[PDB]
Amino acid sequence: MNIRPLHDRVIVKRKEVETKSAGGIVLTGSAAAKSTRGEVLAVGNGRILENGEVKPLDVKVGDIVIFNDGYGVKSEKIDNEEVLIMSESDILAIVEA
Amino acid sequence: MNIRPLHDRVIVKRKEVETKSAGGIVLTGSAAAKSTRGEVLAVGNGRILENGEVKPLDVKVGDIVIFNDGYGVKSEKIDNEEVLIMSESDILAIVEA
Amino acid sequence: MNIRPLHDRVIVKRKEVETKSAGGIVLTGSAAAKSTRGEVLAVGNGRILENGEVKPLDVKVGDIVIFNDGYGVKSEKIDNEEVLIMSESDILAIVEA
Amino acid sequence: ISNIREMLPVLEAVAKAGKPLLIIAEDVEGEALATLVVNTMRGIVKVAAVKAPGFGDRRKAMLQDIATLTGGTVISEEIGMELEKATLEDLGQAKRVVINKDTTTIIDGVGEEAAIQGRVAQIRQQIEEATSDYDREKLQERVAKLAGGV
Amino acid sequence: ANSDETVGKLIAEAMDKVGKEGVITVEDGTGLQDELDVVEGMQFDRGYLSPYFINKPETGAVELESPFILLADKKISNIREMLPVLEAVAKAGKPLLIIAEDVEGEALATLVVNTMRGIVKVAAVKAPGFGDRRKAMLQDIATLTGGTVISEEIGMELEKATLEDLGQAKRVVINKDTTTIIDGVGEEAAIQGRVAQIRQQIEEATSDYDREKLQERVAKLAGGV
Amino acid sequence: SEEIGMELEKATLEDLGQAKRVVINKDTTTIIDGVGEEAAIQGRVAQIRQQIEEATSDYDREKLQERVAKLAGGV
């Protein structure tokens, strides 16, 4: 037992804070670039909006994702390590192309 | 693998910042005209609003488009290059006439 | 190719700024009367609100219209000339009587 | 001159005609000045920009006198002339213009001599009405710049 | 000097080294004995921005061998402007001297991280004086280095500069007070055209106090102070 | 420090110096006998001493003399 996302909810680890060697060259100082890239840890059941039969979420555990660092997006420790909790809709995207 | 738009979401490249030779004549200085024209890079599945059967988005990859530079419209690097992420409804239009 | 309105969207040319000879008599100075009258240029498909079968918009190309100069109403160049982009509902009316 | 956004159709028109240009206005904003520098430097239009002389009513009067000399029109809000609605017929012309860090000088207008004399006669009549001797001298300079020399 | 032979010979020697363009100045001396200090090349009275750049701590100072020099108008707000130039210079491999009117904390701290850990060898210094004479002296510095002054007025983004748009010198040396540059890459004929422009404005100089400041600018470009 | 780009959160026990004893009062702090290498101390003393020879302010030259004295010798 950790704790489990509800309906419409996803849990992810933020990849980095700052991709520190800029371009692959310059070693950046304090830039504040909390990474837009996350990676999926848990996925909460399905979406239970709209009364009828429950829809599976289109994200899955193992996915590498991008999300909005918005008001809805929360962060807390799994064990002792910070991970982020949000809705499928505060997520923007999953590994294409 | 890049990362992929969700349901109702579209990814586009902004064409220019400033159409620099005004009218085709005058070479404009600092005007701040971040172009209203984009061009489609990826299209996220369909729209999953309203419970029932999923609707395909009416935009497609290869399209040249106009969008609102609004609150909903986000921007981030594909590889090292900035591209813009938004809903079908924050998009205004696709190449008519 | 110009660019095309989405679902629920309409494109129009604003008729005048200032109907300059007031009453047909007095030649008005700087009054700021950006005309409430527009004329239709393009009409985006139909309205795709509410899941089921798609409804045609009740406006058409060639129509002379009145709209609200509100927050929703955007303006941009077709070729080099400013025209206005909005929803069917930010439009108020089409040529009666 | 707040923006190049006002300036555009005149800039298109003058560049297309091909002649150099002198911009008189009460001030020029950073966007406007920087854009003019980009156009001159890279060769699109040959343009000089200078500030209007003195202040208030005598600045307005001297700008009309400058227009009478050049054979041009003064663009103002009072006449209801948008900068955006000016054309190349609405610009005066001179044979040569020369400008320094301190001083501006214009050599030999296109303005009609009879119009110049009508405007000189107006200015001269107000000399005969001049209660302030200090300002009468300033009226004497305006007659002298239009006709004769200082 | 009322029959003071030492004063006479010191001035004869100084006029010797500085040249006709060169300016000789008088200051309170450190000791009982008179001394003469002659500097050739482009020296000006602005120090190193941070002490972390010190690559000669036994000289108390920074020395950079064959550097590119970047001249910028206004403030360096971020490394976000700096990036493509930083990538380009690092990839080329040469040391670098940053001239700008100021450097912001994010920019200065990032430069310290890169120098300290060895990625790029970079010194940062502040522009001399204020207003129009700072702008003029920055053009003179660019003429000496054989470089381009990056400014908003010319419409040059810092982000759109390239390595062709940077001047160069044989050596640069910098202290806590003073900056000095040894032997430009700027073309001698261009230097003389710019000297001739500056010299012509000496002949126009109503303020004698500012005429001296014009004399220093001619002297720094050609001759010594 | 921030200038070197060192987060307090990213420091380790290798990045802390050490002394044999430390003693502290309501006014005064004193440290007895460092772990710092003597050659490094002398290089840093030599840097400080060279700036004494450059010191235009006699008042601040005394303050440079105290820094040399605290590092080597006593006050």
Numbering used by the authors:
A (entry chain Ba), B (entry chain Bv), C (entry chain Bh): 1 to 97
D (entry chain Bu): 227 to 376
E (entry chain Az): 152 to 376
F (entry chain Al): 302 to 376
What do the authors report?
In this work, with the use of cryo-EM, we resolved two conformations of the bullet-shaped GroEL–GroES complex at 3.4 Å. These conformations exhibit differences in the relative orientations of the apical domains of the trans ring. After additional refinement, we have solved two major classes with different orientations of the apical domains in the trans ring. In the first structure, the apical domains are located further away from the symmetry axis than in the second one, and, therefore, we denoted them as “wide” and “tight”. The estimated resolution was 4.0 Å (C1)/3.4 Å (C7) and 4.24 Å (C1)/3.4 Å (C7) for the “wide” and “tight” states, respectively. At this resolution, we can conclude with confidence that the subunits of both rings contain nucleotides in the nucleotide-binding pockets, most likely corresponding to ADP. According to this classification, here we observe the R′′/R-ADP state for both tight and wide conformations. The assessment shows almost no difference between nucleotide-binding pockets of the cis rings of the tight and wide conformations. At this level, it is not possible to find out whether one of our two structures coincided with the structure of EMD-1046. If we do not take into account the difference in the nucleotide states of the trans rings, then the wide isoform would correspond to a time-extended stage when the GroEL–ADP7–GroES complex begins to bind ATP molecules in the trans ring, but the apical domains of the trans ring have not rotated yet (i.e. between the steps depicted in Fig. 6d,e of Ranson et al.). We propose that such complexes appear under low ATP:ADP ratios, which precludes the substitution of the ADP for the ATP in the trans ring and the subsequent release of GroES from the cis ring.
